[PDB]
Design a protein around this ligand. Sequence first.
Ligand SMILES: [Cl-]
Ligand SMILES: [Cl-]
Ligand SMILES: [Cl-]
Ligand SMILES: [Cl-]
Ligand SMILES: [Cl-]
Lengths: 219, 221
Amino acid sequence: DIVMTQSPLSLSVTPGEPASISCRSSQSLLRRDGHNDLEWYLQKPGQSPQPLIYLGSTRASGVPDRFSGSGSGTDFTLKIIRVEAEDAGTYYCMQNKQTPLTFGQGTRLEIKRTVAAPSVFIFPPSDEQLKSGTASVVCLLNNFYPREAKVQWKVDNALQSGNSQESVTEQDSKDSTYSLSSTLTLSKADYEKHKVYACEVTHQGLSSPVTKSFNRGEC
Amino acid sequence: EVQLVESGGGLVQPGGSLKLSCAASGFTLSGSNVHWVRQASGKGLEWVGRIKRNAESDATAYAASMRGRLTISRDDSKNTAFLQMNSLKSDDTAMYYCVIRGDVYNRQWGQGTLVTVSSASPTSPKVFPLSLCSTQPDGNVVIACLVQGFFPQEPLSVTWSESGQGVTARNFPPSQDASGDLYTTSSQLTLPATQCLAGKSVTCHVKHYTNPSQDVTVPCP
Ligand SMILES: [Cl-]
Ligand SMILES: [Cl-]
Ligand SMILES: [Cl-]
Ligand SMILES: [Cl-]
Ligand SMILES: [Cl-]
């Protein structure tokens, strides 16, 4: 099979500035007609890959002029001359010289910007949920950059583990910030034995942690 | 709109069989070789197999790791191609795409369908209105819905009954619960305070899997 490799595996670019991604193939993809059996895609999370370039350099239908493919043989480059927010996602090169069709690893482009500290919001379990036997406490972080952020849950000052989960949005179209949802899930029985629920956030942009808390039954 | 529409996925028992359909909508599939490609959540793209046009006697080819367990077929009269999978295993769980090749008139990927090889039945999310207990941000109001304990993790989407100027909805990907094998997420809406006064409510609408959608009222504070 043909092995496709990309470099870098991630990059951060500010809007208006150029990005490039390199792709290498283990076999030459050069065609008799001078084109190459090489295609580039952009994939946004959960969505089908979108064709950007095929035949090495042919820009696909409706693809913006800022995307260009170049190279020949075993070495190829995707250039985005002026990065825009909507260009964030994972880029793949792919050979179609033979089956099995093979893809590179994927390069995640994110939009660079200045540091932004998260705002933090805490929500107690709904009364409706409590009646079914489960208690979820939710801590939402908004408007932060870079993507790394740490949530610590405390119940009466005891650090929690093995009972929470989190996920993070893609970057906001307008300000390129991330948001994060952390959920602490306890049984109703355990939840009602304790008083102080706290989510403590730390981040590059925070000079001190931000802790949002509530006393059970006071919301 | 012209596109490739997939169906026939979802949950399937280990050892079970599932036939995916790839139906052309607004173009003719006959001129293309039809390929199948899959992607496990958070992972890369992997070719599954192909079928050539009838002109080439519909010749098939399969990925090494699934060869003995696949039949790709096509029905040009229905403008549809099929991926029959058999003896499915946990490691076949993935989002499956069909892809057309070889037709200068048409280049299309299907929207993808998630195949989950599991002994579990589906579980609809339990959707709850949330009320902020910390402070509201200057000028705006935050409300949210908890979307708890669902399976499989996709498809899942949430929309709100307010949108437009000054309104931002945040939708977080599903994550696996710390115990119990289900998934949970939330959806948040931030809107001008004047647009979410006491006595006003907003609804979150939650779609999941192939079951009926849910609509939950979320009171403004
Ligand atoms: Cl190509
Ligand atoms: Cl452009
Ligand atoms: Cl900065
Ligand atoms: Cl998956
Ligand atoms: Cl394509």
